[PDB]
Every structure is written in structure tokens, then in C-alpha cells.
Amino acid sequence: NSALLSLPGYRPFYMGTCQDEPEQLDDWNRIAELQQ
Amino acid sequence: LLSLPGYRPSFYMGTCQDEPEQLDDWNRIAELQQRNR
Amino acid sequence: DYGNSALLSLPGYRPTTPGRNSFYMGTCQDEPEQLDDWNRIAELQ
Amino acid sequence: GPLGSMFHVRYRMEASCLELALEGERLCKSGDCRAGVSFFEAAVQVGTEDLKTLSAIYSQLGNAYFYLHDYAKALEYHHHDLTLARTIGDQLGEAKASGNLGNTLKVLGNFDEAIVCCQRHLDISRELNDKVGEARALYNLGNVYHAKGKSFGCPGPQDVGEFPEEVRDALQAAVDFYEENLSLVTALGDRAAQGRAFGNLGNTHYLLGNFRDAVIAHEQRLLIAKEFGDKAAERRAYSNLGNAYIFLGEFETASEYYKKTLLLARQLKDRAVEAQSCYSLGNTYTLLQDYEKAIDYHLKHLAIAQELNDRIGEGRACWSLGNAYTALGNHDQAMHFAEKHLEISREVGDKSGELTARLNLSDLQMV
Amino acid sequence: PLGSMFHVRYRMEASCLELALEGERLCKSGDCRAGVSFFEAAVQVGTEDLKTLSAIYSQLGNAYFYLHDYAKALEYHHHDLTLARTIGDQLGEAKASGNLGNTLKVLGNFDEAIVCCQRHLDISRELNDKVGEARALYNLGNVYHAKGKSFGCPGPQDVGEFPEEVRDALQAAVDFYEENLSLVTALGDRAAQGRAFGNLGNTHYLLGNFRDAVIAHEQRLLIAKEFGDKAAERRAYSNLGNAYIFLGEFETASEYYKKTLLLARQLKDRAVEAQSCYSLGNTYTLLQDYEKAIDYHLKHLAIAQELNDRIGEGRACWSLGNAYTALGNHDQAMHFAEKHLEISREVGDKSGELTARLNLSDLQMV
Amino acid sequence: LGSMFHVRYRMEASCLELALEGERLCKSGDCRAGVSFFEAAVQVGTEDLKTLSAIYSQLGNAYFYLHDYAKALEYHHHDLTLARTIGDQLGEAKASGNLGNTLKVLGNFDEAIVCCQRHLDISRELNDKVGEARALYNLGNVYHAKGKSFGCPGPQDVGEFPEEVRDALQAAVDFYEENLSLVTALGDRAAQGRAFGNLGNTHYLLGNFRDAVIAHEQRLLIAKEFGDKAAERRAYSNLGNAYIFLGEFETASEYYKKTLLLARQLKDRAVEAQSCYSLGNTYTLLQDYEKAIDYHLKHLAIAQELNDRIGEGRACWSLGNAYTALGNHDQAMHFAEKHLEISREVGDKSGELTARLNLSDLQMV
């Protein structure tokens, strides 16, 4: 049963994605503030 | 010593000529398609 | 792990606190890789 | 006389590690991270005594490589940052490096180790009572489980359950983490982070099949997007809302949300989003069985697709137009787009589409 | 027209069976490169019907095998075996084991190939399936034949020190082929009898049992005539010529190589026609009739230049050089020795290049 | 008399014949073609293990020269394996030495030490004095390279270096002096020269400049004895370098002048340019910036000739600072621009940032 659904294809319009929230890299200014 | 490459202390022919590998299988799926239709 | 200096595997660091001090110089050039070996095979029994 | 004609000779020297690093950071600020990487790795070659500076260099190199999609070297430098933070016992630095290492592992598909690293970020944050760090770690964990659930069954039978249990468990874990993040973020009064949480929570419910909860979350994302005047986020909320109302069966409501995406897409002059909006509207009016309006929007999508030379989307429009015209009775116009569907499907390797366009023309020819 | 509420069900765009049937039709037509794409597409869609899925895996393995992508051929035949084992389809298990064995045979993993083909044999005997038993015997013969063949090309004409590992493997092939022959003759399958005689003859040929090889190939020839299979008839003629060379009866060998050339010219197979001329050239060289040897080596050269077979061109040049040298044509020998040097450089035959130099040095002295 | 039998010569290509052709190609300096003929002989194979050993070793040495150190490792490893099984410990030591030098280039110093140590021990066991000396020289070279692989070398003002580097360089000094002792006893003047050169450069890296001068003076004397102008020029260059760090810039200039003399007679434009560049820096230390500009210009012109773009930027930066020390702010701004241009073109990220910081300041006067 666990080996059974190991093979591609099994078991008894068009959409568009869920469009997630953009990856947060608001960071660009650590090194200039490290000028201490 | 026994594993080191190329050692142990032709004229052209075109030898053998074997028998061909048999494949014919391109039928089993369409064959199953009258086995249920 | 115990190792105050074994972390030196991390790229470049480490602090320690007539005549010519500073200003730039150059390089030096060593001695020839000596290959006399192109006639080891040719002598044979 | 100058103030520095011999202090000009002091810059004729060569460049210090800090100077190279600062140049790399300015290039990344300007958005040219390809040049920034060269100056960062140059600072690495010079080296420094200051471990706090070195930690910053590694982390910003990892983040720069991450943005440039060179995830292998992003893993390298975030791993070095973690190693350095661990040896010097900087627990705050250790947590932040673990989080970045986790997100890198999340993209390269190694979810099991990604869980470990983001869990480490959470645990250290709770130990130090760093509430903002605790929240970011919760958000990261939600993102990882969201991505784990999204990997496999993409494409794959999805209507009314049942999937694998593995997928439902991962998505439910994402819901739990996002809601925990939301609770802590609402208590800290961080409206920006609240918006990001609502968006991802809504899309997770959408994949799970909990469409009513998805609508509620995206409505909150929409309100926060308006508060910040973020038109891009506002458009994303409108698009997600339309998607959810489709699956609820309220196609009229969905059309008006897709219309609002089109309005903002035309004002931002984003041709790609504009085309995706027209395609969604075409399918919506197909569900409403108003095939004349469906053809109108599917044509608008086709024209933008040909403009952007999006060959894939061209075939999608041709197939939709064929069946819209077939539902109206225009057998000659249907045969035209079915031929165009066959041609594109061959050119792009859509083996599924090619077989269907053949089965379509066979039938169309006979009436 | 009388049913125009049609084309929303065929329009949808999807089904696994439809993609699979398209893949099979492409393989039927001989374009297995396109067939593979449609098969793997059906794999992506998937199906509930495990009997269909088994057929898809097997025909994908067979298709990849024909396209020489043995790595993926191993993948899908391994999946077919796994599926047949879980559902307890023992007939399907045996057939999948056989295909997995032949794939492993080409990949040089003979030890596991033996296991898989042995499994095919055992299950066939257990279910009393005589046709499957015969096919498994033939497969086992083929594997040992290939295993024996894989121990060093430096055994040319005609070795002498055969290692016991090679003799044991070839003798095992002889045993399996004869067992296959016994069962096939009892089942009355003339086609399978022909295939057995051919491989049995070539195994005896490698073993050095040339008289037994002649006998087996003579039977292959008779069966090829019975079926009117000119291709098989030509293979039998070629194997017979080869064997008579090693027996030392060069006159008999020449007439068998002549019959290969006859059928090669009628099938308009230029490649086989050239190989036939080259064999005839070497046969008359053994007969020391160097004039006739030059005639056939020239005919081989011309076809080689036609087919742009640069390798075979150098082989003709070297042979012509030594044929002319045996006659005394020092000028014509120097011409082909130069052409031998040129080709040997162009194709990277480092051995040939050094020989052509050692040939011209000597030839120049007259 | 009987040369109407040559169809028997037509078949061939013997294991030996392919090998001899490979060796002749390497003798002529086309080792790319020689490798093909050697590997062809490997394909044929032979019964003679002494021949096979020679093939492996010369293939390793050929790949080594072609900078394909991975396959150089392969065939020297096979030569070592063969020498070990049949017990030609004479063959074993020589193969270990070649394997060590290969490992030395690849940066695997730890294994390189062991292999050349094996060469040394076997040579001492067989009382092979010439082999013992060659082992000592190899060990010196490995430690010299190990010490150099950490170096952004710092005798600067009063500088410190890691203990690992000093230990490796001191080990090289010990091995070179042991080699020198055995080589002087064997009366091999050529090997004495090579030892003095490497000993001098090791002392130079260590900061023992007086000992470096002494060693290079001996290298110079031996180079004159053999009439080896190339070695003479190397000694002159090393001597100049050492006198710079001693602080005697006048003496250094006259040694760099002698390098230029021999470079112009050998018509070596590349060495001639390096000599002018060293002279430019020497007169900069002597604060005679007019003469420094003269030699840095001569270096620039040869650099543009040889299209050495890297060295062009080096001249531009030096000229900028020489003109700045004189006060020619317009001429300084010209070479600072050229320094910025070249540094961009060659990817010198350090130089690019400096040229910007230079033009900013120069513009204000």
C-alpha cells in the first residue's frame, strides 16, 4: 500500500496561481551603519 | 600487479554477424483498447 | 567543540597587536623545474 | 595650497576591506547585485580582523547570491555566517543566520533541514525574549511548510479533497504558524507584517480548500494594502479574491474582482498582469455562459500575448477561443483557432494540447 | 448535421489512455523519439488502471531501449517489475524480469542480468508456460554469449589462450541455446529455430568449434530460405564464410562471400556490399591471388569513398599497399601508403600513422 | 640482402614503437601529440614490466608539463603501484618523488610530505647519494611552496607572520642546507647553484635578508661559471629585491640596472619591462621622482607593446603617484583616469575603487 502509490499515476477550465507575498529582502544597509 | 592497465608476461575481417534483437511490442496498448471497448 | 583557533577555516582574518618601512616592492622568481627526462625509454635491452 | 596634496598620496595606496565592502553594499542598494558580488568577494580576499564586519559581509553575500538565484553560493556564505556566529557565541547572529540558511534550503527543496534551521531560529528567539525575531521565525516556518505542501500535486487531482495526507498536514502546519505570527504581530502593532501574514494565510487556505477563510484573510490584506497605498499588494489581493470566489461558485462576484485587477493593471501599465486579468475574465464569462463577452476578453489576452511573444499563452488563448466559438456555433472561426492551437502545441512541446487539438478538428470538420 | 452537440468532451484536453495510444502509434511508425514524449506525458497524467499502467511502463522501457537510453530503460522496466510484483501478476513479473535482464545485459551488469533472466525461466516453468520458458532460455543464452564476448577484443585471429572464464560462459550459452532449440523444435516454431541456430553457430565460432558452427549456420540458411528472409540468408552466408576461413578452406570461403555479395547487390545495401568486397579481398590474399585481391579491395574503396566512410578508406589503403607490394608495384604501393598515412592522421589512428611511416621508409628504397 | 619481404612490416604498430614515437614528440616539445601516442601504447600493452614502468612515468611527466595534474596523478600512481608489487624499490622511490611533486602543485601538502619522505628513506637505505640529494631538494621545495601558499607576505614596517608559515620556511631552509652539504660533497656544481637560489629566496621570505644576499651571491658566482645568462639575471633580480628590504636603495638600483643590461642583450621585452618597473620603484624610494617617472614610462611603453593590460594599469597607478609627488596635478589626473579605465577592463575591483578616491582628491586642486 505504501509501496503501491510510489509510481506516477494512481488511486480511486484553467485557473492561475495563488500569487504569494513577495520574499522580504528589505535589507541593504547594514555595512554603512557598521561604519562606527 | 594484477590490475594495472595493459599487460601480461589481428588483421581485419569483420567478424561475427549476430542475430537481430526482436522487438514488436507496439501493439499491447491498442490491443487492450478493444479488450474493454 | 573546544577550539579557539581551529575556526581559522573561515576565509581570511586574525588579529595580532638604513631601513625601509612600508611602501610597495614586487615579487622574486625561484629556480627552474628541471626536466632532464626525455630519454628514459630510449635505452632498452 | 591644498588641504591634502600629500594626503592624496595616502589614497594612492590600495583599497581596504571595509572600502570594498561598502562599495558592494552600495551596488546592491542600487539594484546591480551582479557587480556588488564581485566587490564583496574582493573584500573576502583582503580579509579583516573585525569579526562583526566579517559576519555582515558573509550575510549580505548570501543575500546577494540568493537574489541572483545562485543558491549554491548563497548556501556557502550563509553557512559561513552561521559557523562564525556559533564559534563566537553570538546567539542573536546565530538565529538570524539560521533563518537565512533555512530560506535558502527551502528554495533548493531540502525542506527537512530547512525546518531544523528555522526551528533553531525560533528557539533562540524565544530564549532571548526577542519578540520581533520570534515573529520573523514563525513567518519563516509558515513559508517553509507552505512551500513543502506546494511541492507535488501541482498539476494533480485537487477538487474536493483528498490529495495525500502529507500535503494537508504540511498546509495545516503553515496555517498554525501564520496564525501564531499574526497573533504576535498584531500585539506588536506591525501593520506591514500583518499584511504579509494575511496574504500568505489566505493563499494557504485557498490551497487547502477553505475558501471562505481565504476570502476573509485576503479582505484583510486588501484593507491593509489600501492603508499603505501599496497598489501592487492591492492588485494581488484583488486577484486572490477573484480566484476564491470562482471556487465558491459566485462567478458574478469573481468577475468584479477580476475587473478591479484589470483597472490597476492598466494604470500600472503592466502588460503581463493585464493579460492574465483578461484571461481570468474570459474564463469567468465562460462560466457565466456569456460566450460573447468571453471571446472579447480572450481576444484582448491574445493580442497582448502576441505582443509579449508569450508563445505558451498564445496557445492557451487559441484553445479557449476555439471552444468559446464552438459554444456559439461559429464553426469556421472555431476551426481557425483549433488549427492555431495545434500549431502552437507542436511548437512548445505541449503533448497534451497537441492530441486535443487533433480530437477537436476531427469533430469540428464533421459539422 | 445530426449530432452537433459534440466537441466539449473531446475539447477538454487530457486523458491518459489517449496520450498512451498516440505514443504507441508513433512507435509503430518508427519515430520512438516522439513516442517517448507522449508516453511520459501519459505518466504525468496517471491512471487508475494498473493493467494499463503496466503496459505503459513496459513500452516506455522498450522504447528507451531502442533509443539507446539504457538508463531510463532500466527505470521503467524496474517500475513494471515492481508493479507486477505487488499485484502478484506472475506472468507480468516474468516478462518484466526478462526485459530488465536484457537491459542489464547491454549495461554490462551480467551478474544481475543472470538473476533476472533466471527468474523469468523459473516462473515460466512454474506456470507451465512453454513459450515463455523457451524465450527465457534464449535470453539466458544471449546473456552468457555477451558475457563471454566482453573479455577483451585483443583476442583476434585466433587467440589460443582462452581464459577459462570465457570458455565456461560460452559453453553455458551453448547449453541454453540447445535447450531452447529442443523446446522450440517440439513446439514447432520454425522462426525461433532459425534464431537459435544462428546464435548457436556464432557461439561455437567464438569457442573455436568451427565444424559445429558450420553445421548450425547451414541449418540457419535452410530456415532462412524457407521463410524467404533474404536478410537472414545473407547473415548465414557471411557466418559460413567466416568459419571456412578459420578451417583453412579458403576456396569454399570465397564462394560463400560471393553469395553474400550477390544478395547485397540485390538488396542494394552498399554497406554490406562493401564489407563483402573487403572479405573477398582478404580471402584472395590468403589464396595469394593478389590480382583478384586488388580488384575487390578497390571495389570496397570506391563504396567507402561514396559512403564517406573515412575509417574504411584507410583500411582499404593499407590493404592495397600490401597487395601491390606482394606483386611488386612499388609506385602504386607508395601511393596508397601515402593515402594510408593521410587518413590515419585525419581519424586519429595513432597505430596506423606509425605503420604508414615505417612502410614508406622501406618502400622508398626501390 | 633480401628486402622483397616488407608486407610483414605493413601490419604493425608495436608497444615499443608507439612509445618511442611519444618520447620523440616530447623531446621536440610537442607533448600534446606525445600523450596520444603514449596512451596508444598503453592500449596495446606489453609483457615487459620495466618498459611499462617507463611509459607510466613519462606519461605522468608529460601530463605534468601539460598542466593536466589529474592525469599526471593517475599515471605516477600506477608507476608507484607497479614498482611496489615487483619490489623495484629503486623504482618505488623515484615514483614517490614524482607523485610528491604532483601533489605539491595540487596543494595537497600533507600527502606530498609523506611521498617525498618515502623517496628520502629508500634512498638512504640503498645508499643512493644522488637520490638522497634529489629527495632533500624535493622536500625543500614542498615546504617552500607550503609556506608560500599562505603568504600575503608581511615583513611590513615591523610585521608578524603565522607560526605555521615560519615553521614551514625554516623546514625548507634545513632541507636545502642538507641538500647543499651532500651536493657540495658530490661536486655537482649545477645542483649547488639550484640549492643556493632556493635557499636565498627562502631566507628572503623569512626576513633573513643578509643570509639571502649571501646565498644569491653564490648563485651568481655559479651562474657565471656555467655562463648561464638566465640564471645570472635571476640572481641579479633577487639581489636587488633583498637590498631593497635592507634599506640600501642605491645598491639595489645597481643590481636592477644589471638585470636590465642582461634583459636588453637577451632581447627579453617582458623581463626588460619588469626591470624598468623595479627601477621606477627604487628611485621612488630614493625620492628622485623624475627618474622614477622615466623608468615607469619605459615600462608602460613595453607593456602597451606586449598588450599586457594588467601591467599597463600598474604603470598608470605608479605614474599618477609619481606625478603627484612632483605636483603635476594635470598629468596625475590623466594617468588616474587611465588607471580607472584599465581597472574596470581587467576586473581589478581594488584598483577601481582607489582610482575613484584618487580622482576625487586630485580634482580639487
Side-chain angles (χ1 to χ4, degrees), chain D residues 83-98:
Chain D
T83 306
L84 167 55
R86 174 211 221 140
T87 303
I88 70 172
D90 178 13
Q91 277 209 314
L92 186 56
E94 186 181 342
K96 271 160 179 180
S98 298

Side-chain angles (χ1 to χ4, degrees), chain F residues 3-7 9-123 125-133 135-151 153-156 158-262:
Chain F
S3 76
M4 230 45 59
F5 283 97
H6 290 296
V7 182
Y9 221 127
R10 300 212 77 262
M11 252 301 301
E12 301 197 347
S14 35
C15 213
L16 262 70
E17 226 164 327
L18 299 179
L20 284 168
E21 180 65 12
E23 194 193 44
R24 199 209 26 74
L25 298 161
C26 288
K27 154 212 151 263
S28 74
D30 191 346
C31 295
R32 190 111 270 169
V35 155
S36 299
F37 283 76
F38 280 135
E39 271 199 326
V42 176
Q43 292 305 109
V44 176
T46 177
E47 315 212 307
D48 188 332
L49 303 173
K50 295 260 204 190
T51 299
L52 191 62
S53 183
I55 310 298
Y56 291 149
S57 184
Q58 286 214 31
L59 250 184
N61 278 340
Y63 275 111
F64 186 81
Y65 186 49
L66 286 172
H67 303 278
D68 189 335
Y69 302 114
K71 285 332 146 180
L73 251 73
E74 207 184 10
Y75 285 111
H76 281 312
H77 191 85
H78 296 98
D79 187 30
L80 172 83
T81 306
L82 167 56
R84 211 161 155 147
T85 304
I86 68 105
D88 253 22
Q89 293 202 42
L90 192 50
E92 188 169 33
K94 271 318 146 172
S96 298
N98 283 337
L99 199 64
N101 279 68
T102 305
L103 287 163
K104 171 196 59 157
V105 175
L106 262 203
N108 294 332
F109 293 105
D110 309 330
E111 321 226 40
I113 296 311
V114 171
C115 294
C116 172
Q117 172 34 230
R118 279 210 62 112
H119 178 66
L120 182 62
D121 83 77
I122 298 169
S123 36
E125 201 256 30
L126 252 203
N127 154 266
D128 176 19
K129 296 146 154 209
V130 296
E132 191 181 328
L136 289 169
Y137 189 94
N138 289 335
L139 281 160
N141 272 16
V142 184
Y143 277 110
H144 183 88
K146 183 202 147 141
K148 215 192 267 163
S149 68
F150 307 98
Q156 206 162 40
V158 184
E160 322 282 315
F161 34 93
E163 194 87 346
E164 297 220 339
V165 183
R166 193 175 82 186
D167 288 344
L169 296 177
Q170 281 291 341
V173 172
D174 291 331
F175 283 130
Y176 287 143
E177 282 173 341
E178 279 178 60
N179 178 70
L180 175 68
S181 180
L182 190 51
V183 166
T184 48
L186 285 166
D188 190 328
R189 205 76 174 148
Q192 279 165 72
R194 295 194 294 269
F196 274 120
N198 278 342
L199 184 62
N201 290 319
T202 308
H203 278 304
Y204 174 76
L205 292 170
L206 271 165
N208 295 322
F209 308 116
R210 197 67 57 176
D211 301 320
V213 172
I214 287 178
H216 291 309
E217 212 159 331
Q218 288 299 110
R219 175 91 200 71
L220 172 74
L221 180 64
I222 291 173
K224 151 85 196 169
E225 157 61 57
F226 224 60
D228 191 5
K229 301 228 150 208
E232 296 179 57
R233 194 277 311 174
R234 296 131 95 215
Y236 283 140
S237 283
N238 298 334
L239 282 162
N241 293 351
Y243 277 104
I244 289 292
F245 274 141
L246 278 171
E248 297 159 41
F249 311 132
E250 196 66 42
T251 312
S253 65
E254 297 159 17
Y255 280 111
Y256 286 138
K257 281 166 201 146
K258 289 179 199 183
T259 70
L260 177 75
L261 182 273
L262 264 65

Side-chain angles (χ1 to χ4, degrees), chain F residues 299-300 303-304 307-317 342:
Chain F
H299 164 259
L300 170 65
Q304 285 166 335
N307 276 20
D308 178 23
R309 207 64 174 161
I310 304 287
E312 267 190 79
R314 300 344 307 149
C316 293
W317 160 75
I342 277 150

Side-chain angles (χ1 to χ4, degrees), chain D residues 1-5 7 9 11-15 19-21 23 26 35 38-39 42, chain F residues 314 316-318 320-321 324-325 336 339 349-350 352-354 356-358 361-362 364-365:
Chain D
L3 75 185
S5 61
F7 273 98
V9 177
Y11 267 137
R12 314 227 75 263
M13 290 275 298
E14 270 178 9
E19 285 157 21
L20 292 171
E23 181 65 13
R26 201 200 94 267
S38 299
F39 284 76
Chain F
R314 300 344 307 149
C316 293
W317 160 75
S318 299
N321 176 59
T324 312
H339 185 219
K349 306 301 163 191
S350 165
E352 180 178 337
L353 242 183
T354 63
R356 274 192 237 126
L357 282 164
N358 284 101
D361 289 53
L362 276 176
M364 91 146 278
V365 154

